[PDB]
Amino acid sequence: EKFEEKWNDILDLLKHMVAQKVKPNLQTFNTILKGLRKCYSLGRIPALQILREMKHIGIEPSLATYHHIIHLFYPRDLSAIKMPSLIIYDIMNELEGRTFSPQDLDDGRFFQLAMSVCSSLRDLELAYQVHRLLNTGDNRKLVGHDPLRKVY
Amino acid sequence: LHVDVPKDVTRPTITTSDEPDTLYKRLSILVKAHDRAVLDSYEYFAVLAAKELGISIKVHEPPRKIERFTLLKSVHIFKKHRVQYEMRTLYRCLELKHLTGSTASVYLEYIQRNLPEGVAMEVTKTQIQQLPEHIKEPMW
Amino acid sequence: KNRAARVRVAKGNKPVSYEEAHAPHYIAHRKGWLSLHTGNLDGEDHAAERTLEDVFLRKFMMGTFPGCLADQIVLKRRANQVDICALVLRQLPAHKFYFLVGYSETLLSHFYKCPVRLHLQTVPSKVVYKYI
Amino acid sequence: RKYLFKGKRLSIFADKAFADEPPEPEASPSLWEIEFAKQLASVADQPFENGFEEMIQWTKEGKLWEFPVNNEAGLDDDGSEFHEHIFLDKYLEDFPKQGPIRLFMELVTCGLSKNPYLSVKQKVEHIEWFRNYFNEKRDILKENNIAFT
Amino acid sequence: YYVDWRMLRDLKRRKMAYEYADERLRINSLRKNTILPKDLQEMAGDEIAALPRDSCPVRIRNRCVMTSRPRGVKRRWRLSRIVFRHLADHGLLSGVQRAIW
Ligand SMILES: [Mg+2]
Ligand SMILES: [Mg+2]
């Protein structure tokens, strides 16, 4: 019923992960962010905090981890199109030239979502960056499956 | 591709070891085929490939072999009437010189993977090594 | 008179392909070999096994593509790879060919323990070299 | 403004001064871990883009020969050595040290040393066969003045 | 099904000679020498005789694998002269041509 209670509960599971000397993995953070996509409005500050904690721990954000932050910051059913967020530009700068490998089950989803956000913003310069990232190394393998390859 | 080009193509990992490398004084590659034209095209591909990697190469044509045998033309009797068949083997020898063991593996793979159908190779590596440490010093 | 592999003359109404028109004495002169392997070269082994495999591979493709073969198949062996190149008439629907290719490759790769690939070039109809 | 890596963090966890302390294979791969790996591969599973990619896959699966060609690839005769194949007189200790049986077994072991089509284990079986054969024929040998074992 | 009953008997002769190859080698070695007592050689002469007749490797006949023809076979291809000519005259043997010279 209450998000604040719900969020504090999930955090309690994380606090018991340190009491038992259990270190989190990439999937742990990806799972938390995938859950946050429900509360677009209130999940923005929590979601960014997770990614900062991911780097400090030493876990490297994968394509799936950004796929979830984009959904949470650029809703498809977004009435407030007047002033969209600029995070997509920073993400692409962060990932410029990096090569990625399969490390999660949502890595394929990232590219299809990134192009969609480019079409919504009508920025063709950003679309070139996204496609340019797809061509570096063997990133082409994470474009997506049959449903998401033709959408991209 | 006109506008869409790979950006940073991935390249295989080549790690230099600490083991010393083999030294091949000579490396004779005898290709065999029923067709002379195929050997001419393969000889051009192999000589061009060697020259592009810095390898020293020479080519000569060993004499061809023709194996002929006779068979009985009829199914029954008619002994004196026969049919003869032959198989022709043609050779092209690519004699390489002064190759390290890494250069001989990459070259042989590249040319062996591109060996046309109907062509057989016979590589004859000739390694050069020092004397055995025991033999170096006479011990009674 | 010699009868071997000779398509005889009738009244000028019998279509024959280039392969059929040429008698055995034109082999290596006007027409090449349908199979190309290294087993009949000098000092080479396993000729009998390559020849037996070819006989079977030709009967298999005839039955698997009944009435869909425009000409004899060409077999190409490189390393342990086998390549079957067949001219096939455009009779069957396109999706049916994709089924028979996947089936014939997997079945012949698990039967001879080598990678087998099928190469199909579709012709509108049999190509006639001459009418004899 | 919305800096991706500048700002407050959860801070529930601490910097990993100790990293990956427990080994990745804490136990033999479970069904849960074995199946998750199969799904990770499918994430990047795309069809072949050219004949090179197809041949690479066949090579990883053992379907296609490795190059340069090695006619003895995967063919190790129990990790033996030349001295094991060539010097076989150690196995003739049970046999008489001299006499006709020794003279015969010398010829037998000489041929076995020059046999490239048999393994060391198979060659020993040939020697063992004669040991039991002569043991059975102890009575005939004794008549001929040959003493076996 | 094999081509005929003659090819079937040959196949069994070839499979029983493979089983008794080591045995017939070890026993026959005791006979092909002059270093062992003649009493042992006379006894080994009967142990080899007692083995089944189909183990003897001289009872194998090379037959065309496709027609089971006993004579006229070419050992490199294992085919009769009639079957070989059908494959050769159609361009189906790799590198075989007619001999004109
Ligand atoms: Mg019958
Ligand atoms: Mg005989």
Phi, psi of B110 (to 5 degrees): -60, -40
From CA A32, how far away is CA A11, in angstroms rounded? 10
Q: Which two tokens stand for residue D36?
A: 């998750």
- Beta bridge mates, B90: B33
Exposure on the CB side of residue B55, measured as CA atoms within 13 A: 28
Asked if B7 and A136 come within 8 Å (Cβ–Cβ), the reply is yes
Asked if D2 and A48 come within 8 Å (Cβ–Cβ), the reply is yes
From CA D34, how far away is CA D32, in angstroms rounded? 6
Angle at E98 between CA E97 and CA E101, to 5 degrees: 120
**Residues belonging to chain D with any Cβ–Cβ distance to chain C shorter than 8 Å:** 58, 63-65, 69
Which helix (H) or strand (E) is C78 found in, with range? strand C74-78
Three-state DSSP at A70 gives helix
For D20-66, the DSSP string reads S-S-TTSSSPPHHHHHHHHHHHHHT-----SHHHHHHHHHHHT-S--
Q: Which two tokens stand for residue A110?
A: 């990232």
Residues 6+ apart with CB under 8 A from E95: B34, B87, B88, B118, C33, C40, C41
Resolution of the solved structure (Å): 3.1
- Beta bridge mates, B120: B32
Residues 6+ apart with CB under 8 A from B105: D68
Q: Which two tokens stand for residue C103?
A: 């089936």
CA of E31 to the centre of ligand 2 (A): 23
Pick from B33, B113, B117: CB nearest C76: B117
Which helix (H) or strand (E) is B19 found in, with range? none
Tell me if the bond preceding D68 is cis, omega within 30° of 0. yes
Q: Which of B112, B114, B119, B125 to mutate to test the interface with D (most CBs of D within 10 A)?
A: B112
Phi, psi of E97 (to 5 degrees): -135, 170
Residues, chain D: 149
CA of E3 to the centre of ligand 1 (A): 7
Residues 6+ apart with CB under 8 A from B50: B56, B57, B94, B96, B107
User: Burial code of C85-105, b = ≥16 C-beta within 10 A, e = fewer?
Assistant: ebbbbeebeeeebeebbeebb
Q: Which two tokens stand for residue C118?
A: 């099928």
Three-state DSSP at A36 gives helix
Exposure on the CB side of residue A129, measured as CA atoms within 13 A: 17
Nearest residue to A72 via CA among A41, A114, A107: A41
Three-state DSSP at B58 gives strand
Distance of residue B78 Cα from the nearest chain E Cα, in angstroms: 14
**Which ligand is located closest to the Cα atom of residue E59?**
2
Pick from A56, A90, A91: CB nearest D15: A56
